[PDB]
Amino acid sequence: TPWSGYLDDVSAKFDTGVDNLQTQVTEALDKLAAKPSDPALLAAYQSKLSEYNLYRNAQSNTVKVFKDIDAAIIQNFR
Amino acid sequence: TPWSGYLDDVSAKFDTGVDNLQTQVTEALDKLAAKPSDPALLAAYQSKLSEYNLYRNAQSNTVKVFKDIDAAIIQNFR
Amino acid sequence: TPWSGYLDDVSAKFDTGVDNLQTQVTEALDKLAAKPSDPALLAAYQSKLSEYNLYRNAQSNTVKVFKDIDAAIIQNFR
Amino acid sequence: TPWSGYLDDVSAKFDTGVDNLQTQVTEALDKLAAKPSDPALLAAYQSKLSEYNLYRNAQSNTVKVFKDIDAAIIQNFR
Amino acid sequence: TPWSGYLDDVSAKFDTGVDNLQTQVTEALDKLAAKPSDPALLAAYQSKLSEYNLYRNAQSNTVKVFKDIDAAIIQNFR
Amino acid sequence: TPWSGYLDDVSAKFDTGVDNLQTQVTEALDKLAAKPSDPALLAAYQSKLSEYNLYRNAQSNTVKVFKDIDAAIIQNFR
Amino acid sequence: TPWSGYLDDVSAKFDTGVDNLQTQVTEALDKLAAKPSDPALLAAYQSKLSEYNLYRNAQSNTVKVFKDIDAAIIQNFR
Amino acid sequence: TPWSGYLDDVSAKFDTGVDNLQTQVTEALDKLAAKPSDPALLAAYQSKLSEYNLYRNAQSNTVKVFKDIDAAIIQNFR
Amino acid sequence: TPWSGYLDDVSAKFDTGVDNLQTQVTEALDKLAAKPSDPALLAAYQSKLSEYNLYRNAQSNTVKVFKDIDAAIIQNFR
Amino acid sequence: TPWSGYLDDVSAKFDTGVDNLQTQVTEALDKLAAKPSDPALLAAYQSKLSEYNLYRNAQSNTVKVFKDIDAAIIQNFR
Amino acid sequence: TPWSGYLDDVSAKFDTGVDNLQTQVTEALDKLAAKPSDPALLAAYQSKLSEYNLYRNAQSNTVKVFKDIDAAIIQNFR
Amino acid sequence: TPWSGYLDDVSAKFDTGVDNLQTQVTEALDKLAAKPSDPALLAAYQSKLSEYNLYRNAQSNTVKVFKDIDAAIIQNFR
Amino acid sequence: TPWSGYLDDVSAKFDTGVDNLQTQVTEALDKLAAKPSDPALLAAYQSKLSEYNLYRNAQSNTVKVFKDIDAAIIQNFR
């Protein structure tokens, strides 16, 4: 069984919170690269890329906060 | 179920806000290309093309604003 | 009873300080998406969107300041 | 009571600053479309349309300036 | 007696340094909104608005500098 | 009679040293939240918030120093 | 005493640099509108109108340059 | 084996997404330079050059976005 | 004796590096405002204004760099 | 006679090391607040403010070092 | 035999993890400097330079983390 | 021997990468200024000036990137 | 004989490691201040200033590390 800590479970909630955003970004890029002059494909790709940008930034900053909460408590043991 | 974020829902309101503007531009182009010397077809195509031009510009700039609002908040987590 | 801290009460003052700005932005977007070529609707939406932009930026930066004031005091306990 | 911010009040001064310019443009267009070969109607419509053009450009650029003034101050909080 | 700190006194020097710039911007806007096609009023308003823009930017950045000078000294107490 | 130690009297000098800074910060926030796009209100709130930030930091670090002076003397009793 | 900044003084040099160009344009228009078929009046009005056109364009662009010089310096404070 | 990172693979999808656009632009230029007064050659070259213009702009901006996503995560390691 | 630091001496080298550029810009503006339709005066003023623009930008950015070099060293004292 | 310790004498060397830097910063601010759009006044104030910033940081960190040297020796008495 | 610690072995995994990225950046720069107006060479160099930028940042931050883990353990010996 | 760092060697590759582009721009300007109405001289000067424009922009941005790579590593020493 | 410790000898290796970088920065500034619009002088000064910036940062951080190594050993005497 692969072990998962508390910081893993926080980062897992973003991964399960979006259904297939990792799939939808890759598929929208492949349709865009086939014909990069379609306004229907450009506006669709702008939405999914900007959505994926806010996805990783909210994920990585959240893990950073819970790390600093835990490190402040462990220091007060000794 | 295809997942849709908040930026998807903002861009979807422009898509549902016009009924068949993507259809009307394509149909007016096909009637124009059959006979590109009809003043009734030129004036009809000028209206629909200029309407489609303002459609994508208002859509793409609106998504850009809500991205910068969200990125300013996520930065203030840590 | 839902508990509310001091940082909740600071952020609540921005929420009660505007009456229905969350409503007015959504309603102005829906009227704009119905007809995105009306100058009366574009100028109305520019005002409410720029007002909503300054709303969240002043809110999020204010909470960040009071967090750093409190964290400086808690560090000087031990 | 409909809430109005500072940027709303700046844009409202242009709206109250002209009495019925939104009415006068629409009425001059309706008289022009009835008979678009009258020089008295063409010269009247040229004046009101060019007046309405300078109206929206001075309005929209003014709101853009006060937005950038406010965003520079809010950034210097934290 | 309303208390005023050192950062208040720095920001007060910009307020007393201009006599009635807050008045002159508001009065020039009201004369402009009455007739927004007068070149004498546009050129007068461009000067006062750009002057008011440099006013707040020089004020807010100056207060930010003296804050960081003081915070560096207070940290070296303990 | 509420008892007050020496560390209470040091912290009381900051409280009496400012007249109504706790009042002025709260009142400036309430005026800002009513209309968070007024440059006169943003620049006033930047001054009072940054003044309140230096207030608590100078207060809390000063009490920390006098604690460590006293604890060094009490250790040299036995 | 009406306060005048540096950008006011730059724009004032164009106003004092021409003696009565604002008067001469208005007077030449009034003589032209009385009899708009006089070649002596048309050629006189072409000269003064084209002179007034270069007047405002050189004035407004000059103020724009000194604004961008000042804004680049104020940014390098903090 | 030539190593290829993730940013290489994103830029490679635009290169494989078009078949021979780098060839078609060069060949259309060579046919145009032989006889630069043929309307069949001018209209063919306008299409391929404008297509190649949107090709590089969509490619270079996409790589810039994924760089800023990665740099935000690497900063939150320490 | 007026004291001058190292950052004063860096900024003084730009001031002594140009002989009378502050004079030449003011004199070219006064000759331009007397007759703002002379191509010999417009082309002379374009050269001196663009020269003065690069003067302040190179000056202010240079002082900003030496400030950040010094602040990095002073931090490594304690 | 006002008593002065060794840490007073170290901090006094910075005060006597600059002649009138406390005067020059205050005078440059008063000239700037009278006309905050003069590039000669902005560049002069950038130099003196950045000089005053490095002044207090080098002063306060130096006193912190000599405090920690003395506290390490006093601890080794008993 | 050249000795290699644990921090050397962590940094060595980035060096062996890329095959010839140090070679590919240098070769792409030499081809770019020969003709710095080729879009095929600019887009190739943007990819390799941005890849090399993320390479060193992920390497240097990783070594910093394992240093702080080890220093926390060594402190708890005595 | 004149010392040259790594950033000097990167900037030197652009200088040696072009043979005499600094010479060719100056010579094409001198031939153009002798007779600025020759289409053979205008089209030759457009090519060399636009080539020199891309030369300095690619040079200066490349040095900026390697500076930020080095500054990120030096920060992780202490 | 001027005494030199171990920390002096570490800082001396940076000073002897560059031949005349202190000279080359000062000479490039003097040539730049004579004519601050020469692209050959701007690009030369960008290279030497950025080289001098990395020089002091690598020097000052290195001395800080060897200080903390020595202070950890001296503490373990008693």
Residue numbers in the entry:
A (entry chain Z), B (entry chain T), C (entry chain Y), D (entry chain S), E (entry chain X), F (entry chain d), ...: 3 to 80
Describing publication, verbatim:
Completing assembly, the helical needle filament—composed of early substrates PrgJ (the rod) and PrgI (the needle)—is secreted in a type III secretion (T3S) dependent manner and polymerizes on the periplasmic face of the export apparatus, extending into the cellular milieu. To further study the atomic details of the needle therefore, we isolated native filaments from assembled needle complexes and subjected them to cryo-EM analysis resulting in a reconstruction with helical averaging to 3.3 Å resolution with excellent density for side chains throughout allowing us to build a de novo model of PrgI lacking only the first two N-terminal residues. The PrgI monomer adopts a helix-turn-helix motif that polymerizes via an extensive network of interactions along both helices with surrounding subunits.
The injectisome is a specialized bacterial organelle that utilizes a type III secretion system (T3SS) to translocate effector proteins from the bacterial cytosol directly into a eukaryotic host. Composed of >20 different proteins, the injectisome forms a syringe shaped nanomachine that spans both bacterial membranes and that of the infected host. The major structural unit of the injectisome is the basal body, composed of three highly oligomerized concentric rings spanning the bacterial inner membrane (IM) (PrgH and PrgK in the Salmonella enterica serovar Typhimurium SPI-1 T3SS)3–6 and outer membrane (OM)7 (InvG, a member of the secretin family of OM pores also found in the type II secretion system, type IV pili system, as well as the phage assembly system).
